[PDB]
Design a protein around this ligand. Structure first.
Ligand SMILES: *[C@H]1O[C@H](CO)[C@H](O)[C@H](O)[C@H]1NC(C)=O
Ligand SMILES: *[C@H]1O[C@H](CO)[C@H](O)[C@H](O)[C@H]1NC(C)=O
Length: 7
């Protein structure tokens, strides 16, 4: 589970 800096 990984995402980019908010929007
Ligand atoms: C990426 O988005 C997810 C889902 O909102 C989480 O907030 C996660 O903490 C985010 N990653 C970063 C590096 O901000
Ligand atoms: C972070 O940016 C990436 C593009 O590299 C994706 O668009 C991802 O969906 C973004 N995450 C959020 C939480 O907007």
């Amino acid at each position: 589970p990984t995402t980019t800096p908010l929007k």
